Design a protein around this ligand. Structure first.
Ligand SMILES: Nc1ncnc2c1ncn2[C@@H]1O[C@H](CSCC[C@H](N)C(=O)O)[C@@H](O)[C@H]1O
Length: 281
């Protein structure tokens, strides 16, 4: 009965930009539209990956396929995307099928747990918080093992802090943040779990990866969540029509709540890079 909290693609179209990106944008230049800023976040990730023409890139949690398209277009690489959504899958094939390229392009309806084919490079933008702590060793091991000697991966993920770190900020705020996080992980992304940055880093390291200092995206998620919130708000009535007032207020609280806790430095978002020992310098 986890599917009570399932919301239709229609609803998400009433807050997200045209690319249907459901992750932190990168406003650099700061004057970028959200849509521009989502392309910019995609580039930010891919440009870390030492992609060369004819490599195969893996997108773990590929959504609507925008990352994969931009990759094949910009880097002339083959792509493979993993998604758990039947709709995302059909969309992705259509998106990929339209590209003017001899490059191989492929999208699978399944998790990384079931993927074990050799790829050169890996991107994963905000799928990670769906995985669960219990699965982290197996994730970084799978990723290390499917890549060549020079492999690289980025993982972008919202992040919380260890209950120890949060107490330093005061108990009132620490229990309040804990409850909000439970909310996210229950009603927004059922079964989810926010890692901390330190977990992202150390699991990567235990698997054999070199991990430079993660990049914080916090102010960008502030701006993203502002625009997401404002957009849903301005579409209040269509939103309710497509779902319920329940669903609507649920998402307004998510967007405004995250924006608030990010502003309060109670949440973060890290773009972590994992480099195999043979990665290019
Ligand atoms: N175990 C898993 N393996 C592969 N994808 C997973 C997964 N668990 C969740 N996901 C996927 O992760 C994606 C997170 S939403 C973000 C999608 C896209 N990268 C973007 O930035 O917009 C969804 O496609 C969801 O189905």
């Amino acid at each position: 009965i986890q599917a009570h909290y399932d919301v239709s693609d229609d609803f998400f179209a009433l807050f997200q930009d045209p690319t249907r990106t459901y992750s932190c944008a990168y406003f650099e230049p700061p004057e970028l539209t959200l849509e521009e800023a989502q392309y910019a976040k995609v580039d930010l990730n891919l440009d870390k990956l030492d992609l060369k023409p004819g490599m195969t890139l893996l997108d773990i949690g590929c959504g609507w396929g925008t990352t994969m398209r931009r990759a094949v277009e910009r880097f002339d690489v083959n792509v493979i995307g993993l998604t758990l959504s039947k709709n995302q899958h059909a969309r992705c094939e259509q998106v990929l099928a339209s590209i003017d390229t001899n490059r191989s392009r492929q999208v699978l309806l399944q998790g990384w747990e079931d993927f074990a084919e050799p790829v050169d490079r890996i991107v994963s933008i905000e799928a990670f918080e769906h995985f669960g702590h219990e699965n982290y060793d197996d994730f970084f091991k799978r990723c290390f093992n499917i890549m060549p000697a020079d492999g690289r991966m980025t993982v972008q993920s919202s992040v919380s802090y260890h209950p120890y770190e949060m107490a330093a900020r005061g108990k009132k705020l620490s229990f309040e943040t804990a409850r909000f996080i439970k909310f996210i992980v229950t009603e927004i992304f059922p079964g989810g779990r926010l890692p901390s940055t330190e977990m992202m880093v150390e699991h990567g390291e235990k698997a054999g990866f070199t991990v430079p200092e993660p990049l914080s995206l916090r102010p960008h998620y502030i701006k993203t969540l502002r625009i997401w919130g404002d957009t849903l708000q301005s579409n209040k009535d269509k939103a309710i029509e497509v779902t319920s007032e329940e669903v609507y207020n649920r998402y307004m609280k998510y967007l405004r709540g995250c924006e608030h806790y990010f502003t309060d430095e109670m949440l973060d978002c890290s773009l972590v890079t994992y480099l195999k020992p043979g990665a290019a310098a």
